[PDB]
Design a binder for this molecule. Structure first.
Ligand SMILES: Cc1ccc(C(=O)Nc2ccccc2)cc1-c1ncn(C)c1-c1ccc2c(c1)OCC(=O)N2
Length: 148
């Protein structure tokens, strides 16, 4: 019984990065969207797209995913992440807001993710799925137009 499917929106937590808005999707080369790392039931991964103007994709462990509703969740995510931060500087980094080009990308991503959330599964899959030209990842022409 899978928690997510292609088109579902999630927040992803990767070490060294803030919680990021994402959408579960199929890996363009592997053609799967979920896997068991080492065939262990506890190490399930999902393939996700990271929302923003500079797109990326990755296999993220399900344990590092929280279903996405909106930016309102973000404050509590940082708080829960800082609660178990093994350092005070590590807790300061998590509670402090995002800066630089990363902030710009994160806000762009929140704008696309909240639009995707207001859409149905098939509408958001048709609009936000990355277009792949051989080995190049491109943003959907419409999404690229709305970003820049
Ligand atoms: C999966 C990935 C691939 C490559 C890179 C990468 O290139 N990182 C890097 C770090 C320092 C200097 C230069 C490059 C980061 C991630 C990455 N891991 C976790 N998160 C949250 C991301 C990520 C961060 C920002 C955006 C993003 C994804 O996608 C949409 C977008 O506009 N911004």
């Amino acid at each position: 019984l899978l928690k997510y499917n292609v088109g579902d929106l999630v927040w992803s937590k990767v070490s060294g990065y803030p919680w990021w808005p994402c959408m579960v999707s199929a890996d363009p080369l592997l053609h799967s969207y979920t896997k068991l790392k080492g065939q262990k039931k506890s190490a399930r991964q999902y393939h996700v797209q990271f929302f923003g103007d500079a797109p990326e994709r990755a296999w993220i462990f399900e344990k590092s995913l929280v279903a996405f509703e909106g930016e309102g969740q973000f404050e509590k995510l940082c708080q829960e992440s800082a609660k178990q931060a093994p350092t005070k500087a590590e807790k300061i980094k998590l509670l402090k807001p995002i800066s630089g080009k990363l902030r710009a990308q994160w806000e762009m991503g929140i704008v696309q993710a909240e639009e995707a959330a207001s859409m149905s599964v098939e509408e958001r899959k048709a609009k936000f799925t990355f277009l792949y030209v051989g080995d190049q990842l491109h943003l959907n022409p419409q999404v690229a137009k709305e970003a820049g």
